[PDB]
Structure formats: C-alpha cells, structure tokens
Amino acid sequence: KSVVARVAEAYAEDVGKRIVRMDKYERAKLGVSVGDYVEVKKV
Amino acid sequence: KSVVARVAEAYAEDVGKRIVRMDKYERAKLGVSVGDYVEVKKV
C-alpha cells in the first residue's frame, strides 16, 4: 500500500540524518516500523 | 528524484496530522518544498 503525506520541515537536530519522521498511523498503513526504510517520491 | 530514507517516530504534536518531516537535503533530492505532497512506499 502507498500513503500520501504532506512534507513538513525537519527539526534542527534532525537536519542531515537521512530520516523520515512519520507517526504510528502512517507506519501501520505502510507496514513499516521505526528503523525500516521507505521510498519517497513527489506526488 | 525518489529517495530512500529511514523511518523514525513522530513527535507527539504531529501524531494524526498525516505529515512527514524530512530535511532540506532530502527535499532537494525529491524536488519538493515544505507543504508539498509525497508518496511513501515500503522498500
């Protein structure tokens, strides 16, 4: 399944870390858990 | 354009808002700004 989400900016401490922050709803809808890798592209 | 990134948990503030926080480096690779919509898929 594919989840659409709106891009928000990173917190200063996260700038540079190659992470994507998403909540438990988008994580359950994707089938991923914290530490997994996901593919992101522009709508 | 599509980027692979690593899932981290969201701030409590952001839970339920269907947002994704990514920094300026991944935004430049995606060719998106803050407020654009992206598609997230499991790798």
Report how many domains make up chain A.
1
If contacts are CB pairs under 8 Å, which of residues 12-31 in chain B contact chain A? 14-27, 30-31
How many angstroms separate the CA of residue B28 from the nearest CA in chain A?
Answer: 11
The radius of gyration of chain B's CA atoms, rounded to the nearest angstrom, is 11
Q: Provide the domain limits for residue A39.
A: 1-43
- Cβ atoms of A38 and A8 closer than 8 Å: no
Give, for B4, the enclosing helix (H) or strand (E). strand B3-8
Cα B36 to Cα B31: distance, rounded to the nearest angstrom: 10
Contact criterion met (CB below 8 Å) for A42 and B28: no
**Are B21 and B10 spatial neighbours (Cβ–Cβ below 8 Å)?**
yes
Sign of torsion over alpha carbons A19, B34, A38, B12 = positive
What was the elucidation method? X-ray
